[PDB]
Design a protein around this ligand. Sequence first.
Ligand SMILES: CC1(N)CCN(c2nn3c(-c4ccc(F)cc4F)cnc3s2)CC1
Length: 346
Amino acid sequence: SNKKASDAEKVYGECSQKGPVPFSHCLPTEKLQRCEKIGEGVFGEVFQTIADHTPVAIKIIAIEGPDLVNGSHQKTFEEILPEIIISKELSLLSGEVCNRTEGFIGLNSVHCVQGSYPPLLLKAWDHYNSTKGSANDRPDFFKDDQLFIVLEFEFGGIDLEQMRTKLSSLATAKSILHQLTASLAVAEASLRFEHRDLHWGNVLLKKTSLKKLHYTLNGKSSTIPSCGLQVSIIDYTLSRLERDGIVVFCDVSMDEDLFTGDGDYQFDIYRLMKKENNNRWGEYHPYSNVLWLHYLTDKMLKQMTFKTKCNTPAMKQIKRKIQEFHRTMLNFSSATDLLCQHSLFK
Ligand SMILES: CC1(N)CCN(c2nn3c(-c4ccc(F)cc4F)cnc3s2)CC1
């Protein structure tokens, strides 16, 4: 009873709140009217809107209620806290010094709101269902006492799956892999971070006019050619990190459906991660980052259509090097080991 109250105070404190606020304090009429649904998961819904002439992405998660939502029970205050903490910590890495990366996504704000679902969001939900189709329950059954966590992120671009046919050349592919590896290495070094769910819908790409991107790993600064794209890694629902010996993580040791999926290499990775940590998810195993990078390199080699010329000796050489990376990267222990020791990045 007191533990439930402690869990609640921790979440409200992360939100700079004393208690829940109404949906309006957070999504007033104008912002609601500009919402469009852009994604979904068992977790809930993601909308795109505009806040002060800037695009933002808003993730809405029902918490603490008894109803089934998209086939699963809602997370409690205790269970939602890790995603909040991790989103905050990875957003900070863009402004750090010794371990600095722009490769995650900025978190503008996080709120705990109370109310039934806004009709305007239901209308956006319906439009998505009509056009793209939806696996989720229409979220119209929540009562006016229902709590939600509302995470407002910087808008990070289009996901790698939807950019399948839009990359210019194999040079762009190598830059994307280099950006992902460097971002994960910086998070390993700073926070002993594992993403644990880096499928290609969680890799976003935005056009940039910067020719060189920068990161700093343990005080050493390096550059990566942008090839006109800036990568952002998103969605920390399953992630793990630690600060001063205190681990923050998603405890999936009683979750069964996560390890029974089929039809994609993605679902073999959950089973391999479980095998390698003996189902002890607080432990640090940065090899899981390598597994996800390996899955992403497979996508790069098998699913991408390029706009520019592929038969030039230079591009054929890049392809050979990404193939060699694909067949050797599993012999490295971490993203940091890949970044610093793999020949692809030399
Ligand atoms: C269909 C999809 N794979 C691409 C479009 N899509 C987008 N989601 N986000 C986010 C974002 C979302 C969730 C989150 F936990 C953190 C975030 F930062 C930021 N910018 C964008 S585009 C939804 C997923």
